[PDB]
Paper text:
Enzymes belonging to the purine salvage pathway are potential targets for novel drugs against [name], as recent studies have shown that this bacterium is unable to synthesise purine nucleotides de novo. Furthermore, its growth was notably hampered in a medium abundant in nutrients. These results strongly suggest that [name] is critical for the survival of [name]. Using a broad set of microbiological, physicochemical (UV absorption, LC-MS, X-ray analysis) and in silico experiments, we were able to prove that [name] inhibits [name] ([name]) from [name] by the competition with GTP (IC50eq ∼30 nM). The core of the enzyme comprises a β-sheet composed of 9 β-strands (8 mutually parallel and one anti-parallel), flanked by more than 10 α-helices of various length.
C-His tag [name] was complexed with two out of its three substrates ([name] and Asp) and with [name], in the presence of Mg2+. GTP was omitted, as according to the studies described above it competes with [name], hence we expect to find [name] in the GTP-binding site. Our findings reveal that the [name]-ligand complex crystallises in the I 1 2 1 space group, with a monoclinic unit cell of dimensions 69.9 Å, 62.1 Å, 119.3 Å, 90.0°, 98.9°, 90.0°. The asymmetric unit contains one monomer of the protein (thus half of the functionally capable enzyme). Ligands bound in the active site are [name] and [name], even though before crystallisation [name] was preincubated with four potential ligands: [name], Asp, [name] and Mg2+. However, the long side chain of Arg135 from the neighbouring subunit extends towards the active site of the paired monomer and participates in the ligand binding, namely in binding of [name], thus indicating the necessity of a dimeric architecture for the formation of the catalytically active [name]. Phosphate group of [name] is clearly visible in the electron density. It is located in the position of β phosphate group of GTP (GDP), and it maintains the hydrogen bond network of this phosphate group, namely forms hydrogen bonds with backbone atoms of Lys15 and Gly14, and with Nζ of Lys15. The aromatic ring of [name] is bound covalently to the side chain atom Nζ of Lys322 utilising for this purpose the aldehyde group of [name]. The distance between C4A atom of [name] and Nζ atom of the Lys322 is 1.26 Å, thus confirming formation of the covalent bond formation.
Author numbering:
A (entry chain A), B (entry chain A): 1 to 287, 293 to 411
């Protein structure tokens, strides 16, 4: 259908779990932006699969996993993920137009982070996107032709010369990078395809397509909490730029929202709770950089739902809240005496206004609406009424099957 | 509705004309990407309006013109456009999240162009987008607070120091840029708004929104003829990233296609015709850098229609073809003995396969389907059948009113 799964907060909402849970019903599962800054996590029958760039349809061999054109690819790292699975040939395809992360990029990221202090993943995501905007970047299809690759590498070496000292590239950068591609190009080349053509066709034939967002909406380069964002567009619309699909192809948009909020890295966080009331969240939800913890923020949620056109919500990680005395929800902002109901473009001086809810004790592992505590259902009802989007999926532990459908 | 007007070739298709022609029927007209690399041109009653970043609803005072968040803004240049119109306050709004083009950017563009030779507009578009990906860029909202602006300017000056020689910035860069903002910030600040909120609301209230693409689909940074592209996403999906609108809000997608093709700048162009058969196109269609001229390319058109989800086409500049003996249409590609029907990701060795059509003599200024020569209608019929999208608008001169609706 091109349905889309999107994180509607600042990442870590539980996207990997939801994609894995529904992927069996699709022909294609598509990672459309970001890189291995992502960590989409699947748990099933006590086995944890930590994915980075590998799409989250990988546990269903009939699914075709697509890494689309707006992604940035650390080839070595993707090769390491490929090696963990059997017979990925014919069920993983990497866009020939995806951009390639070089070691300069990670070094540059660390260098710039000394002044900017965004809290990046230090994986060179941003600098890879920069080179894409410069139109100097290498793309996956370049690896298919030794002569083209060699030429682009020589232009890169020439271009980075003035930076070797600053970014601490070392004496052997150029020989090391040559050898890198000698090692990894043969490993990844069989998977490189025109995925744009592939998805245009699939859409035309009415095959079922699931688009897997990374990061989350409030990390969007344009509309998120800039400059405390990633360098890619994270919303549902981005899925129908990366891919070849058009906006009219988008059917369901599933907004993945944790039952509380996190950020990892710096930047504004209106509902962050550094008081003892937040300590439960830290104990069970901070954890690898520990996440900043706080409450669900309906102001921000409503904003993200509008940006994405969510048709349904998945409410994630209810089990983290088990045992908490009370749950707060940020229902509005106070800014110097004004009540704000709408998410503003600058969060300066925005203080959360909270409603308090009774906690629950034992959502963990519940598989039926009937088996949930009243206080859980009361919370769900409040959220979906305030936001105006039905909660259709409820996750009660990391396990694939600990998921309730409505 | 959020309808979208998109250029489905490499720019210069006649977008400005179509937006101006239909804008009276909308509440909002939104420029969603690019900058003053654009030149959307309107002619009405013998007056030519050359727009660059100003949206093409400006001649209808009841329209609200929006410059959205994914645009890059040369403030001085926008101020110069503002000064050509009366009472723009309350009918032009500039996103507080739009990025700001600095003089370093244009210089950097010219510097890099010595090695890359893309054929950019040398307006610093690409380097502005680079700084956006770096998350070091200045945005329009920063101009609203003198202290914030001063801080970002000081970080910029520190960051550009190693480049002053290379990019030939000059002794007085820093004092000149300080004075620039002293001059232009007061002029532009009244127009700076949260346009994301504004369009979310308008969409919720069912107000009519027209989204005005710049450049064209084959210039898209991800899916166009990389590296001979612009540094922004140009398709209909990009309109529902920049803006706050979601993909489900998109209704009509009007693909603007010239009756022949141009490119300006370097890069692949399968249907380019440098033979005498193309000379008519050059005489009447090259013209300020002259455009490379060639034939309509249905392979590329079908690709762009899929990317955008076009619901209708506008066929533009029929008058340029008046007097030509014969018109060719590229219906497929030959690549080393293989017939390709689908646009590939690499145009190496793709040679056009042509069908030839009889020309016409006097489409210029015709306002009724009935008054068109048969050979014009035969061409239209062929195009819309091969592409599978109805031609609903036909332009027979630059003049607003020389437009036929079906
Ligand atoms: O998967 C993710 N989860 C949470 N935050 C992320 C993720 N990927 C990137 N980020 C955040 O996005 C911002 C930019 O990091 P970058 O994507 O490495 O440039 C930082 O705040 C990161 O911590
Ligand atoms: O309005 C436009 N018309 C046609 N080509 C454009 C336009 N804007 C940018 N381009 C082209 O897009 C490419 C990149 O230019 P840039 O947008 O200045 O970086 C070049 O091929 C330009 O000639
Ligand atoms: C849930 C969670 C993840 C995984 O979430 P995705 O959206 O699948 O990336 C990662 N880290 C933390 C701390 C989490 O709570
Ligand atoms: C038509 C045309 C333009 C204007 O087209 P837009 O899509 O409005 O930018 C500019 N230059 C040339 C050569 C043209 O033919």
């Amino acid at each position: 259908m091109a349905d889309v799964v999107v994180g509607i907060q600042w990442g870590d909402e539980g996207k990997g779990k939801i994609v894995d849970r529904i992927a069996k019903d699709y022909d294609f599962v598509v990672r459309y932006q970001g890189g291995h800054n992502a960590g989409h996590t699947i748990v099933h029958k006590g086995v944890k699969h930590s994915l980075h760039l590998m799409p989250s349809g990988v546990l269903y061999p009939k699914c075709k996993n697509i890494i689309s054109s707006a992604v940035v690819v650390s080839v070595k790292d993707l090769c390491e993920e490929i090696s963990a699975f059997e017979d990925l040939e014919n069920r993983l395809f990497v866009s020939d137009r995806a951009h390639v992360i070089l070691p300069y990029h990670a070094k540059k990221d660390a260098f710039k982070e000394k002044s900017q202090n965004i809290g990046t993943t230090k994986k060179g995501i941003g600098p890879c996107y920069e080179d894409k905007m410069a139109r100097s970047g290498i793309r996956m299809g370049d690896l298919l032709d030794d002569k083209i690759l060699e030429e682009k590498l020589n232009a890169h070496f020439k271009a980075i010369e003035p930076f070797k000292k600053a970014y601490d590239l070392g004496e052997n950068y150029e020989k090391d990078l040559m050898g890198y591609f000698k090692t990894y190009a043969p490993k990844i080349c069989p998977f490189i395809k025109d995925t744009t053509s592939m998805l245009i066709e699939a859409n035309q034939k009415g095959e079922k397509i699931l688009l897997e967002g990374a990061q989350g909406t409030l990390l969007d380069i344009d509309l998120g909490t800039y400059p405390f964002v990633t360098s890619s567009n994270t919303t549902s619309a981005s899925a129908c730029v990366s891919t070849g699909l058009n906006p009219k192809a988008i059917n369901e948009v599933i907004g993945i929202t944790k039952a509380y909020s996190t950020r990892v890295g710096n930047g504004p966080f209106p509902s962050e709770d550094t008081t003892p009331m937040g300590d439960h969240l830290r104990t069970k939800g901070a954890e690898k950089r520990p996440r900043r913890c706080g409450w669900l923020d309906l102001v921000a949620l409503k904003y993200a739902c509008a940006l994405n056109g969510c048709t349904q919500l998945a409410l994630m990680k209810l089990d983290v809240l088990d045992g908490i005395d009370a749950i707060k929800v940020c229902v509005a902002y106070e800014r110097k005496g004004e009540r704000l109901e709408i998410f503003p473009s600058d969060l300066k001086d925005c203080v959360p206004i909270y409603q308090t809810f009774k906690g629950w004790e034992k959502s963990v592992g519940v598989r039926k609406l009937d088996d949930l505590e009243p206080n859980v259902r009361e919370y769900i009802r409040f959220i979906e009424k305030e936001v105006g989007v039905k909660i259709r999926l409820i996750s009660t532990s990391p396990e694939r099957e600990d998921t309730i459908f409505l």
